[PDB]
Amino acid sequence: NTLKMQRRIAAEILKCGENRIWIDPERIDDVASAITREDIKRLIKEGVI
Amino acid sequence: AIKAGEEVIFTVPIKKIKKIVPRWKRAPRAVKFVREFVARHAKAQEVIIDPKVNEKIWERGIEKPPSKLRVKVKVEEEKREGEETVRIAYVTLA
Amino acid sequence: GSGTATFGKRNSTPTHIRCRRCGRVSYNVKKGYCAACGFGRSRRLRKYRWSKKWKKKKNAH
Amino acid sequence: GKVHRPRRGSLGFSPRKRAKSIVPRIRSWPKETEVRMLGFAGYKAGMTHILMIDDEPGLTNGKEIFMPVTIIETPPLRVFGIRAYRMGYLGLETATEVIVPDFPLDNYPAKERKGKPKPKMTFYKLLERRIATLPKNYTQEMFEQKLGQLEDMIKEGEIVDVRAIVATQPWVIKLKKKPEVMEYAIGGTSVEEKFNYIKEKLGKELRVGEVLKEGELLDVIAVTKGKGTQGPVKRWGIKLRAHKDSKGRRKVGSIGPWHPARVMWTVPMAGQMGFHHRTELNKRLIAIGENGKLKLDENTEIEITPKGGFPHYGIVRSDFMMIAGSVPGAIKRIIRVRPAIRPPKKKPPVQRPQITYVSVESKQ
RNA sequence: AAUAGGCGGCCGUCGAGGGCUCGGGUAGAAGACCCGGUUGAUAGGGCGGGGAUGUAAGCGGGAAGGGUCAACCGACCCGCUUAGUCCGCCGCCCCUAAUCGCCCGAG
RNA sequence: CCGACACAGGUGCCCCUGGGUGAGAAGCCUAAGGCGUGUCGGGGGAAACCCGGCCGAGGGAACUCGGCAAACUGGCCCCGUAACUUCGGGAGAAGGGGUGCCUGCGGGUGCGUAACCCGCAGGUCGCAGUGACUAGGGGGGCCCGACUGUUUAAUAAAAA
RNA sequence: GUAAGGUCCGGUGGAGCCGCCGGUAUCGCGGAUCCUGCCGGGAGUAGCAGCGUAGUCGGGUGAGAAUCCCGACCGCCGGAG
RNA sequence: ACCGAUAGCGAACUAGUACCGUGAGGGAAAGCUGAAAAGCACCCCGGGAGGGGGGUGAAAAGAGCCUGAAACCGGGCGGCG
Ligand SMILES: [Zn+2]
């Protein structure tokens, strides 16, 4: 469960570098469960990303 | 000795290892020395070092750890899995 | 020079490509003929009795 | 022709190996008529300097001169054994040895800690840290019988030498607790006289003042400071190779010719440097001080300890010696001294020289 | 030293003595060697001594001048200040760790 | 990708570059972007010796085939500048003085109290003011080839 | 049996083999820096440095974590990485 | 009266194949369980790979499979040490 796809898609969505993405260290299970761009957008709106 | 749920103040002499290691390994060597010193002086099987303490050690880069570090050691007992009882010492700044 | 550094300049157009007639990768692309069967240079096949490759093809040597 | 030069280093100190024991051994003793113990022991403390009116023959006689000195702390030794030597087939062989029975120890610096009374130390307890197997149920009567047997052997004449077995007392100066046990010869020409001299002081304390005389020459025996493994450049003083050498500069060039087809033992090589048994000759004993203090002119008394204490050493609290020049060994090393075995023909007078200044400034 | 030595002591016909482990260097490439181990000042810590640099931060005042010739800015200087910082040196104090444990061993 | 390789080479550095200092696409620091994969880790007064780097009292080439290597000088401004000469040069010849910070004025272009650049007076600190970084040592004879250029890819760059 | 070798005994093996006469032949190996295959000592040694010396703390996953993942700190490149 | 898997054609077999060279061209290694898969059901241990029991078979011949030589390596025994 490496969050490379999630980090890359979040960076692409937010229009920034991949090193500027912050992922909540307490919601790693939610981030790993998120597998689609819709789920990643939902996490971004929630504030995990 | 220190019993469970008790709190002590220690002064770790980090300068004891500056000249025995290369200048660019001094911060990790200081972290190792602090952990070993706390374990020996608290008779603790496990030591948990606070990220604040780690940042204080790494404040001036990998080459200049502080010569002396004042730390706060709290001793707790877990007794997990039945393998006797384990003593865990938590290290915080000041 | 003349060695390992020289071998790094093999990223240009290949000298030989696949031949439409004989099926081997021997077609001189720049000149326009096959170095194996002579396609593009002769109507007849390029066979030489000092060569054993065409015999090897059919196990006739 | 070729170019000649003396060889690098001396072959008279080979093998250059680590000393057999940290406690020095004495192989030869001076010949004297006075009945006294031929030497003493102490611990190296540090170095300082004085200004003194020279009394030795030479150009600078009668002029005030600078003089470096070394301070050796010498707490009194404990005389606790007597050994007898007979003449064997190939040399001296020990015939018997008698030690005194256990006695209470009163110079031990006992300290009251929280709970428990004074430890109340006794002998055979500090000595156990060195011998580890001491007599059990040993009594004064049995000691007297053993001494009488030794004396009877002396009267019969089977004994050709007698020596005193002494032990250091580092606990007096708080340096350590494990003592050093050494054997010392006694001057004179009568075995009976030497035996009486040892017997009258068996079980007692001997001070450097009762043994040595101020202003006399001594031989100093110790183990030099260790340097670890050192290359030939430092070990034998060879010349560095040419600066264009691409295989190194701190090494010997040729380690031998074609023939003999072996490396000769005389070729310098790297190895152990320092920590060697060495003897220094003709070191003058400038002065003897008592209780860490030195008197100058019957009204001035100074503390030999410099301000801030000796570097890597504590404070001198017992009797001490002032030796002109430097002595081998490190700080806190055990040093043995004996009367000079080959003194010069024109020796300096046997008395303390006129001292005008003693340095007690900080040495760190 | 193959004539492979002498002596004192302790042990055996459970057991003297020793090793690993522990705190440190008079020592050190690994081994080895040396001091200490509650029969305690070995290291840390606290206090004091001695030393090395050179007078800390903060505040008050002055400062060539400017500024509505006011408020205010200002390199730098003076006082608190032989200060501050630091010590691979020493002394005193058992507050902390030198604990627990394991192994070999002649008969 | 090619070189037998997750090869410090070559192909491709082929096209593009925020802020400060600075003449600068220089060096140094830093934003964005990227990385901790130019991928075996741990210990140590734990040596000798080797490779890379810093310093060294007095002397200053006495070393050596040979000043090899290293060292001196170094940016900018102002004075000053030889033999010889193909009159163009030599030439940055050589040699000498200055350089920081603060306070305040003057000048050029400019509508401007916008921006850039050039001077003046005073105060003051340190051993040292191009304080790090960047950054020539110089001169006099002789041989050869006029010069810029080319060469033995892999021991000769030269008077060829 | 001088010998080149022959034959028996005990064990493994599971399907072919031998004495004598007369013929026949790719008919006998220790070497050719011989050829092919397999295996030793070197050796649990060298190498895993040099031109960019980079990791630490807390948490997670997992039988198993210096090396995988998240956060913080500390670093490198930044007219090129 | 040829050879019997280093022999016989280079190829007894997915052989002019894999693979080497820009290119003409060059070119290997590799056969065998058992009569019958009857190719090991079930139990204990291990994260797994596997190990130990227990079964099939006249015989494990156990698929890493007919016989299993020599070199080499580990252990046991006899002798020296
Ligand atoms: Zn063709």
Residues B34 and B40: their CA atoms lie apart, in Å, by 10
Structure tokens at D135: 């007599």
In three-state secondary structure terms, D65 is: strand
Interatomic separation, CA of residue B24 and C1' of nucleotide H75, rounded (Å): 52
Interatomic separation, CA of residue D176 and C1' of nucleotide H59, rounded (Å): 82
Neighbours of chain A (3+ CB pairs under 8 A): none
Q: Could you give the angle at which helices A4-14 and A37-46 cross, rounded to 10 degrees?
A: 70
Quote the Cα angle for A42-A43-A49, to 5°: 140
Report the DSSP pairing between strands C16-18 and B68-77: unpaired
- How far, CA to CA in Å, does D2 sit from each of D5, D6, D220, D240? 10, 13, 42, 20
Beta carbons of D157 and D65 less than 8 angstroms apart: no
Residue positions counted in chain B: 94
Residues C39 and C61: their CA atoms lie apart, in Å, by 24
- Nearest nt (C1') to A25 (CA)? G70
Structure tokens at D179: 């003592």
Q: Is the peptide bond before B13 cis (omega within 30 degrees of 0)?
A: no
CA of C46 to the centre of ligand 1 (A): 9
Beta carbons of D18 and D275 less than 8 angstroms apart: yes
For tokens 């004989």, the residue is C22
Beta carbons of D223 and D19 less than 8 angstroms apart: yes
DSSP states of D274-292: S--EEEEEEEEEEEEEBTT
Q: Structure solved using which method?
A: cryo-EM
Quote the Cα angle for D43-D207-D50, to 5°: 55
- How far, CA to CA in Å, does C47 sit from each of C54, C59, D85, D214? 8, 16, 113, 118
DSSP states of D123-139: TTTSGGGTS----SS--
- How far, CA to CA in Å, does D336 sit from each of B1, D80, D84, D163? 45, 18, 22, 16
In three-state secondary structure terms, B59 is: coil
Contacts (Cβ under 8 Å, ≥6 apart) of C6: none
Q: How many CB atoms lie within 10 A of CB D300?
A: 9
With CA atoms as reference, report the closest residue to D165 among D107, D94, D103, D222.
Answer: D94
Report the DSSP pairing between strands C33-34 and D40-53: unpaired
Residues D233 and C18: their CA atoms lie apart, in Å, by 71
Q: Residue D27: left (phi > 0), alpha (psi -120 to 50), or beta?
A: alpha
CA of C8 to the centre of ligand 1 (A): 28
With CA atoms as reference, report the closest residue to D250 among D223, D225, D267, D270.
Answer: D270
CB burial of residue B25 (10 Å; 0-12, 13-18, 19+): middle
Contacts (Cβ under 8 Å, ≥6 apart) of D290: D209, D319
With CA atoms as reference, report the closest residue to D130 among D184, D176, D198, D186.
Answer: D176
| Beta strand residue intervals within C1-61, DSSP E | 16-18, 25-28, 33-34
CA of C38 to the centre of ligand 1 (A): 6
Beta carbons of B42 and B89 less than 8 angstroms apart: yes
Residues D65 and D61: their CA atoms lie apart, in Å, by 9
Beta carbons of B89 and B12 less than 8 angstroms apart: no
In three-state secondary structure terms, B26 is: helix
In three-state secondary structure terms, B71 is: strand
Sign of CA dihedral A19, A21, A27, A31: negative
The protein footprint on chain F, as nucleotides within 7 A of a CB, is: 1-4, 7, 9-11, 32-35, 42-51, 66, 68, 153-154
With CA atoms as reference, report the closest residue to D322 among D284, D274, D273.
Answer: D284
| Amino acid type, D283 | K
Q: How many CB atoms lie within 10 A of CB D44?
A: 23
For tokens 């800690």, the residue is D113
DSSP classification of residue D122: B
Start-to-end CA distance of chain B, whole Å, equals 20
Interatomic separation, CA of residue C42 and C1' of nucleotide H17, rounded (Å): 31
Q: Verify if strand H has an atom below 7 Å from the CB of C33.
A: no
Contacts (Cβ under 8 Å, ≥6 apart) of A32: A1, A3, A6
